[PDB]
Amino acid sequence: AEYSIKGYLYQFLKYLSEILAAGDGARITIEGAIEDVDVIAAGLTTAVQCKYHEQAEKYTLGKIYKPILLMLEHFSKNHVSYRLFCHFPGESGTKALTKDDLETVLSTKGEVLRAIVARIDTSVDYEAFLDRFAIEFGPSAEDLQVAVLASLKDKGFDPDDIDAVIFPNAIQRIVDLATRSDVNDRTVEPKTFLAGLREVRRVTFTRWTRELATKGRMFSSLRKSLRSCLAHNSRWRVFVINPLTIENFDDDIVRFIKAFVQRYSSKYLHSNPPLFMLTGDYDLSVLQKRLYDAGLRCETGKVGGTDVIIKELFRRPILIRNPFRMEFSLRLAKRDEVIGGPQRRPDELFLINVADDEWKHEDVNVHGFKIERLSDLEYILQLRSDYA
Amino acid sequence: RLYDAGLRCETGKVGGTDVIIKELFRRPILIRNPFRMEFSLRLAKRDEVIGGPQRRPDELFLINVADDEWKHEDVNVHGFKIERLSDLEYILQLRS
Amino acid sequence: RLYDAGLRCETGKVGGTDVIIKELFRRPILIRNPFRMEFSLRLAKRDEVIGGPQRRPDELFLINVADDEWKHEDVNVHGFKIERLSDLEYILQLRSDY
Amino acid sequence: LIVGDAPLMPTVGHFALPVPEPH
Amino acid sequence: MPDLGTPIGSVTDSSPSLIRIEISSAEDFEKYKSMLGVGQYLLVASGNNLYLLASITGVRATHVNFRFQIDTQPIGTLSEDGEFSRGSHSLPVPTEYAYVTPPAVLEGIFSHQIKSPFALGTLGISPDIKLKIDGDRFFSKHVAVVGSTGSGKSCAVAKILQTA
């Protein structure tokens, strides 16, 4: 239930700090954590587990009660090296408590504390925990991240670009290869990252990146970048989406579409309805009916409902001023069925969790994102005031 | 084939395999100048149309069918038996 | 049934059973553009209508009735005998075919 | 709007704030 | 920022100085007549996510059905978040909608962009609201008060000095 997210993050930043001050021909390998459930047990069974606590002026046994204790349940349950991270003023050193300290801590006067320790099994090789466990005194998150980016500027980059597009990206690759279910090489080559991160152009909205401290300033840059694009009445915009990674998708796809068409496809000066495309094996008919229930119509480009005709899918609709009547408001299809291309190219293409597409080209703008909840994308497009 | 010929049709479906009465019977958009029209005919099968319309029809034509549920005393029913379709065009004034 | 077919009628009654001549022989509202008409026909039963109008009818068609109280020397009277309604359609030019 | 002998022709333009800001 | 409701009318003619609006229903005019007087303000749309404040300077009503005309002058711009800027560059194309300014918007504008508040009374359409002019610049310089007999000049001066 704990999951110690911030500690789990601390050693990722440690790893990137290790790669930071490193010479050529140096390699480092990460080892995942047991929070992932994989019988394959890939990674040499070299998992690591950590926890993080702060606000203690000088080291004592009393201050650090619960952490070490809570580790032992894991042992009783079943190369899993337990470790602890913390920073306290005047304490800069790594230690290993010997036998008498373990026997000191074994007994606990706090009763509800031992209430669960009763869960512990008797068969414990006491000194294994001690020799395996190690305590680390390193700088707290604040200054460590401060120096992280302060030095990341040292290589030579644009001062602002690093905040919103680079620093969130690397930690993502790190923790990805950390806990990826299927196997691959942990070995990391330093110089090649510089080659990859330079060319990579994407923004990442995910569970780990939000916890990062800089988050809160990556939102607004993206919000202010798209303002010039979304202040036009007549434009041709395209969307592609992959619904595997997204959470709670079947219940949130509809509200998003309604909110978008309410503001961007609801008047006489809006003469080019948008297009939505999905990749996979999704069933559209249900979505079509659920939207009709709300009061909207769609163009699917099917005369007889076997295959697609491109010319009908890219036609212009009828409009009437007084009273307003709109033939259709949005376009829907599946990417596999659409074969060919439009007579006129997109002005803006959006790709959500898609790696590449055939319509990319020099004139088109290609925004890219990695999303886990759709509520995040609305704030980017100015359909709500506050983020999650 | 009708789409290739040039015409557009209304069938009543909203994406699925079932037919909806309110969408089947509805008024089209029109523009006087230049002339534009949304659809010119409404097509279907009898078995799928489960129900009846809001406004009864003025004329019901039947070609080789005996009786239908939409027959009423206040509705004009015209019933025929023909062997070729070219015969009906003459009746309906499309040829001489 | 006429209402279901889409037509409105003037019957000449105000709540009660009795019938009022002045409220059955009155002029309707008319709006020229767009065209609207308050009502298109009158209805009644003969026995209930006791009295007469101030302006006498021009034409009094009688279909299968011998004599009435509204016949006069200065009114045009046409009496017929029919067996089914469709014959009157021909007589009065609604449908050409007999 | 700049007008006078210096400009090629009368023109209008938009400033950009200076660095450091004067105070 | 808030929801604005239903629009009252659409634009018919535009120019960098004058904007003209037309209503065609009597019920709507009768519904909003309290807020369509001279001196009041309207919101006009100039593209997605941007608004233009204008001041009413003329109303007319003619039947031969009903026509209602309103004339305005641009003052400045207001975005979605709430920022307000003097200087109207843009021109709103015809077919655009016009809405009636809700009081909360003006309350906020006065709250955030006046350095030294000084209440000079109450707003016209809504008595609850208060009108905060800049006190620092009023007293620093001169003033003039003019009015005809029976209009309440002396009580007004009295109120000003009393709060002073």
Place this chain on the structure above:
Amino acid sequence: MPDLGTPIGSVTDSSPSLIRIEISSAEDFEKYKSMLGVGQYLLVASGNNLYLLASITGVRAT
């Protein structure tokens, strides 16, 4: 000298002092609204290989 692209509109009246231009599409105007304000400049043709600079003094939309 360099390619100028597609034009906004055509002339509909002329004189030694005044010149009047006419646009007919909403998309084009909405596309070039940033460049069609008062005090800005336009190029008009006269014969072949000769251009005329003009300054805007008024705009109207109906």
